[PDB]
Amino acid sequence: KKPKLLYCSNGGHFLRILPDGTVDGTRDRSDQHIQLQLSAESVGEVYIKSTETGQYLAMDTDGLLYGSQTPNEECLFLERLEENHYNTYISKKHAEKNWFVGLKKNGSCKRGPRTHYGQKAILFLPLPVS
Numbered sequence: 859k860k861p862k863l864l865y866c867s868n869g870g871h872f873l874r875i876l877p878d879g880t881v882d883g884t885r886d887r888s889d890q891h892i893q894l895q896l897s898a899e900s901v902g903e904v905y906i907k908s909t910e911t912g913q914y915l916a917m918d919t920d921g922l923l924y925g926s927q928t929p930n931e932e933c934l935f936l937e938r939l940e941e942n943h944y945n946t947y948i949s950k951k952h953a954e955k956n957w958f959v960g961l962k963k964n965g966s967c968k969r970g971p972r973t974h975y976g977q978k979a980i981l982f983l984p985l986p987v988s
């Protein structure tokens with residue numbers, strides 16, 4: 859465990875959970891809302907928590923990412939380590955569909971159904987921060 863940044867290979871954005879529950883990315887490394895905490899619920903699954911607001915990254919039923927005040931089943935992701943030290947993160951509540959956490963090249967969140975293995979959108983490199 860520990861405070862990580864999750865760097866998105868697609869446009870070079872840190873995954874950001876804004877206080878209003880909005881999920882996007884920024885290039886600004888000083889941003890308060892890119893500090894995350896990963897917690898292994900079981901072996902395969904992780905929660906990804908903002909260490910600024912205590913919000914947990916979540917995916918709703920339409921594949922939209924949001925920050926959730928309190929850890930429901932929408933907040934659990936499977937962390938699979940990949941080819942290049944980059945991880946991907948699959949929704950649990952929708953694993954069967956292969957909904958990934960992803961960001962677009964402009965830093966916008968990419969809704970789960972538009973993700974697909976092999977895309978740069980879905981690849982996040984965990985970086986110990988400070």
Ligand SMILES: O=S(=O)(O)c1cc(O)ccc1O
Binds near residue numbers: 868976
């Ligand atoms: O893998 S791709 O470079 O095709 C990609 C395109 C795109 O428009 C959004 C995310 C992506 O990973």
